[PDB]
Design a protein around this nucleic acid. Structure first.
Ligand SMILES: [Zn+2]
Lengths: 169, 49, 49, 96, 92, 345, 48, 169
DNA sequence: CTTGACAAAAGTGTTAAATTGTGCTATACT
DNA sequence: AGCACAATTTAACACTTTTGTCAAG
């Protein structure tokens, strides 16, 4: 089983035993060398976070897509006859396009090559709708300039909603 | 007074620019040497001094 | 500076509209384009610094 | 700007300035009643028009946006109350 | 620089460019919300590396904005300005 | 890196010359006819067992396990078809392998011509798809041209494929690009018109006019039909488009909210909802409670005269006069108190 | 990205240097740089 | 109904996300080019994201406050205020399971230190450029039998699952 | 507060005109 | 880029019902 991409990661992340790894790391902490010991510390911090929060790590690999309400990033016309749309909208659009075409290829029985191509384009589009440009060159409006502002792109930055809106308005 | 089909639209004057009208510039769709936006009717740009 | 790059952007649009259609005799009129150059110049004449 | 016909900005520096003196409710109005808060800003005009005191705000509505915004990233926004218990941010809204 | 545009192939070369006459005077543009621009025609010849077809035709480019007397242009009725850019001269 | 990715993935597997090509197509058609042959074996549709081949070929558990919450599950609607034709003599069990190898050879020939499909979508860029998209849908067009191809006709598959790739691409254009859904024919006519314009522009040495451009378009083409749909064509506008020349200003931040009634309207409306309640009490217990039922004031839905007269025991006529008189009788109180005389908009 | 073909490096790299149309070394650059280093560079190119 | 003095934040699960959603938007069509109304599956859909007009459903089978909350049986639109369109979320059922870029490109690299991997190597994996081992099944590799938590490549995987072979023209 | 009579507004149904969604095109073309 | 054609939607239209109204009770 060589499974590549998110699928495999989902399976293994699911298989994880929080407790066992915990004890193992605890013993690994007593290692005399600062390397194994530091590693054990800095690593176990994560496992610990999971053990306490009771949140399962496999959740990191998501099957559903938390799609923000429509009126939170609408498309509304203005005076003059032309409409106006948010950036996250077109982002979500590319996301579902790849998502559907992928299914189309799946049931189709298409060969492995095409599969990996679209199946990967899924991870890149999806992750682009979350943080656009933290991995690889950002995606911009077709043929123009300004990189679509994704979810994580609205939060951070000096104009982040935490600042331009909620810590001052 | 019935609620009539058409409601007021017309462009008033800004709160703090009191002028006097000078330039009366009308541009109707269908006139020589004027090409308006795709599917718009007559416009007007009035000057206020 | 924008005339040149904005012309090259049409140079490729010329070399592409060649490899197909009717290679026998195509007047350069069907070969050349307007927008790839025009819009490329207007770009600098409006939205530049 | 005077163009769109709107009020000035209370951005973080101003907020801190208020926190300094210690004016709490003054900051409340800023973050809610006199700014964004949905039923709040209306209840204000209601009160003042009726010659009374405006009720204390609840939902800033900008924050309400932030809630679902985070949720879009699969960030469970859990609002607690006075002792580790559920709270309905969006009044009777998304409760499915 | 951008010529000849080559590709049994095509040698389309450059010949000239007709200086356009302003369609609308700098006034008309300022009151029409139109840019002060003139059609810049272009003349060239399409030839073939084999057929020897010398077929020539005067094509057309687009509309190029024109400068006023003072040194400012007219963009959509709003006159604008092109300032100067600075940087170390090319070289070594 | 996704760009280099596909290129280096397809560059791994070579192409196919006439030998391999003709052979592969023959294999595929043999598998197909083998399926049709076994379609009478147990009485299963030619498409049924066809996909039943996929169960053990291009994935074991991954083809039917998640086409949504429901599809054709491995244990239920699949397994009884996998172990059904599984007991048949030689003259049947052989067509199984014919279908196995045909089905594989299909995907094979596809992979072989992939190095073409990509080199095809290269011209079709600028459609609102940066390469990889175009290529994907093109690959779909290949899959189509594959099962529809016929080697017997002595045609090079590179010719048959291209015409389908260009199709699945030029189709994907209208179903992707414009944020607003624009039906195929719409875009078709768009490109037609814009082609004519972008053509006679150089001809006339200037831009056309809605009358002269639509003129060369055909019948029923006036200034309207072109200028009208011209609006439709135009895509929406990114709210992140900077306004002015300074780096602060956003587009979206420049749009109002009229969706929710403004506070001034909260009080403006809540005022009338009351002031009409106090100026109402001067009406008889009939002509008031009835005067509400005709305005949708009571249950919020309007109650026609016919029903009101049924509620009070009166007739479809009496309520009619009741409303008239009761109403103007209030007009006197209004014109004498000036309490409500506003709200005239 | 592109395969290490012997003809690709004949075209690309060439177009980056000896090509006055893809490399415009300003008349100043072809001038100023010309009188420092003690040389005769002809075109606006780098190599020939 | 209760004084809110506390607000937590944590990870969400595919199930919880499924719950947040009122339906799965599919079609890329934002809104019609004609009716400019929310499409059947449109991102801005009014069918499951709630009405744009208070209490007025799409078709208008229920146009008033009178019938409150009653789900429309004709056009499929729950009668309520247009505010729900700003809160009620949605979701997309992703064909193949996919991950979240955050935990990946993050500074401590959550998933990485989690499963005990490195940003680079795990990157090759998640993005479908490189296979990884799950239960090798006794598979030998270059004298060292491959084991779980290891990485493979396009060739070797086939050379193991489909066997090695050479070609001689 | 009421009856019969009756225009206009509104309703139920079929068909025509319009709109919209799909499938194909084979010299060869990687 | 262009096209024939099936699938729906929308529009035109034929006619019944409801509701509002006039004059007299
Ligand atoms: Zn309804």
């Amino acid at each position: 089983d060589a499974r590549m991409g998110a699928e495999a990661i989902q399976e293994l992340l699911k298989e994880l035993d929080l407790e066992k790894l915990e004890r193992e790391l605890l013993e690994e902490m007593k290692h005399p060398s600062r390397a194994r010991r530091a590693k054990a510390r800095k690593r176990l911090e994560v496992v610990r976070a999971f053990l306490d929060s009771g949140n399962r790590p496999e959740w990191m690999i998501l099957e559903a897509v938390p799609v923000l309400p429509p009126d939170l990033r609408p498309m509304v016309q203005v005076d003059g006859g032309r409409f106006a749309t948010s950036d996250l909208n077109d982002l979500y659009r590319r996301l579902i396009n790849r998502n559907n075409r992928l299914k189309k290829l799946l049931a189709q029985g298409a060969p492995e090559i095409i599969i990996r191509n679209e199946k990967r384009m899924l991870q890149e589009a999806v992750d682009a709708v979350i943080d656009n440009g933290r991995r690889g060159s950002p995606v911009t409006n077709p043929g123009s300039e300004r990189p679509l502002r994704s979810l994580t792109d609205i939060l951070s930055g000096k104009q982040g909603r935490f600042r331009q809106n909620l810590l001052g308005k | 007074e019935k609620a009539r089909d058409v409601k007021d639209t017309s462009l008033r004057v800004p709160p703090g620019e009191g002028g006097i009208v000078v330039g009366r510039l009308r541009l109707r769709r269908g006139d020589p040497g004027v090409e308006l936006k795709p599917g718009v009717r007559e416009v007007v740009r009035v000057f206020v001094a | 500076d924008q005339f040149r790059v904005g012309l090259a952007r049409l140079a490729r649009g010329v070399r592409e509209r060649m490899v197909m259609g009717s290679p026998d005799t195509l007047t350069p009129a069907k070969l050349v384009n307007s927008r790839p150059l025009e819009a490329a110049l207007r770009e600098f004449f409006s939205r530049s610094q | 700007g005077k163009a769109q016909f709107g009020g000035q900005r209370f951005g973080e520096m101003e907020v801190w300035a208020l926190e300094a003196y210690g004016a709490a409710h003054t900051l409340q109005e800023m973050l809610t009643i006199k700014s964004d808060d949905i039923e709040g800003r209306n209840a204000a005009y209601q009160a003042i028009i009726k010659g009374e005191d405006v009720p204390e705000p609840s939902v800033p509505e900008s924050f309400r946006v932030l809630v679902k915004e985070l949720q879009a990233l699969a960030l469970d926004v859990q609002t607690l109350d006075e002792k580790d218990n559920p709270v309905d941010i969006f009044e009777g809204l998304a409760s499915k | 620089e951008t010529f000849p545009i080559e590709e049994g192939g095509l040698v389309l070369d450059f010949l000239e460019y007709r200086i356009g006459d302003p369609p609308f005077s700098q006034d008309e543009c300022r009151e029409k919300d139109l840019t002060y621009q003139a059609p810049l025609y272009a003349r060239l010849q399409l030839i073939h590396k084999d057929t020897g077809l010398i077929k020539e035709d005067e094509v057309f480019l687009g509309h190029l904005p024109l400068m006023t007397e003072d040194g400012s242009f007219i963009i959509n009725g709003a006159d604008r300005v092109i300032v100067s850019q600075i940087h170390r001269s090319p070289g070594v | 890196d996704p760009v280099r990715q596909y290129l280096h993935e397809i560059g791994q597997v070579p192409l196919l010359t006439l030998e391999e090509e003709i052979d592969l197509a023959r294999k595929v058609e043999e598998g197909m006819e083998a399926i049709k042959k076994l379609s009478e074996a147990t009485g299963l549709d030619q498409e049924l067992i066809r996909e039943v081949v996929r169960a053990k070929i291009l994935g074991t558990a991954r083809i039917q396990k998640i086409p949504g919450l429901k599809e054709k599950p491995d244990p239920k609607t699949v397994e009884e078809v996998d172990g059904k034709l599984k007991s048949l003599p030689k003259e049947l069990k052989r067509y199984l392998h014919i279908a196995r190898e045909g089905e594989a050879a299909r995907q094979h020939l596809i992979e072989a011509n992939l190095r073409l499909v990509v080199s095809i979508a290269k011209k079709y860029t600028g459609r609102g798809l940066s390469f990889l998209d175009l290529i994907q849908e093109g690959n779909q067009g290949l899959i189509r041209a594959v099962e529809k191809f016929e080697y017997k006709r002595r045609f090079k598959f590179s010719t048959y494929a291209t015409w389908w790739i260009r199709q699945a691409i030029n189709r994907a254009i209208a179903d992707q690009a414009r944020t607003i859904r624009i039906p195929v024919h719409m875009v078709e006519t768009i490109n037609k018109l814009s082609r004519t314009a972008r053509q006679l522009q150089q001809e006339l040495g200037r831009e056309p006019s809605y009358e002269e451009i639509a003129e060369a378009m055909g019948p029923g083409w006036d200034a309207k039909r072109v200028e009208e749909t011209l609006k439709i064509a135009q895509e929406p506008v990114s709210l992140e488009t900077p306004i002015g020349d300074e780096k602060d200003s956003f587009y979206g931040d420049f749009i109002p909210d009229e969706n929710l009634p403004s506070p001034v309207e909260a009080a403006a409306q809540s005022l009338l909802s009351e002031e009409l309640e106090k100026a109402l009490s001067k009406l008889s217990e009939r002509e008031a409670m009835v005067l509400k039922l005709r305005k949708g004031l009571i249950d919020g839905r309007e109650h026609t005269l016919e029903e009101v007269g049924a509620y009070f025991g009166v007739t479809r006529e009496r309520i009619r006069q009741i409303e008239n008189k009761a109403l103007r009788k209030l007009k006197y109180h209004e014109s004498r108190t000036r309490k409500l005389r506003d709200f005239l908009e | 990205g592109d395969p290490p073909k012997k003809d690709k490096a004949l075209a690309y790299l060439f177009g980056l240097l000896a090509d006055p149309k893809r490399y415009d070394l300003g008349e100043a650059g072809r001038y100023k740089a010309e009188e420092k280093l003690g040389v005769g560079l002809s075109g606006r190119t780098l190599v020939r | 109904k209760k004084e809110v003095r506390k607000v937590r934040i944590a990870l969400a699960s595919p199930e919880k996300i499924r719950s947040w959603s009122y339906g799965e938007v599919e079609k890329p069509e934002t809104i019609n080019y004609r009716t400019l109304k929310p499409e059947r599956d449109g991102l801005f859909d009014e069918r499951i994201f709630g009405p744009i007009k208070d209490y007025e459903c799409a078709c208008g089978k229920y146009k008033r406050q009178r019938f409150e909350g009653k789900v429309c049986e004709r056009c499929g639109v729950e009668v309520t205020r247009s505010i729900v369109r700003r809160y009620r979320m949605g979701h997309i059922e992703l064909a193949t399971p996919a991950a979240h870029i955050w935990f990946v490109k993050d500074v401590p690299s959550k998933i990485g230190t989690l499963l005990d991997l490195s940003a680079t190597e795990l990157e090759q994996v998640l993005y479908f450029n490189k296979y990884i081992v799950l239960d090798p099944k006794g598979a030998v590799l270059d004298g060292v039998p491959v084991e779980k938590r290891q990485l493979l490549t396009d060739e070797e995987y086939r050379e193991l699952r489909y066997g090695k072979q050479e070609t001689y023209p």
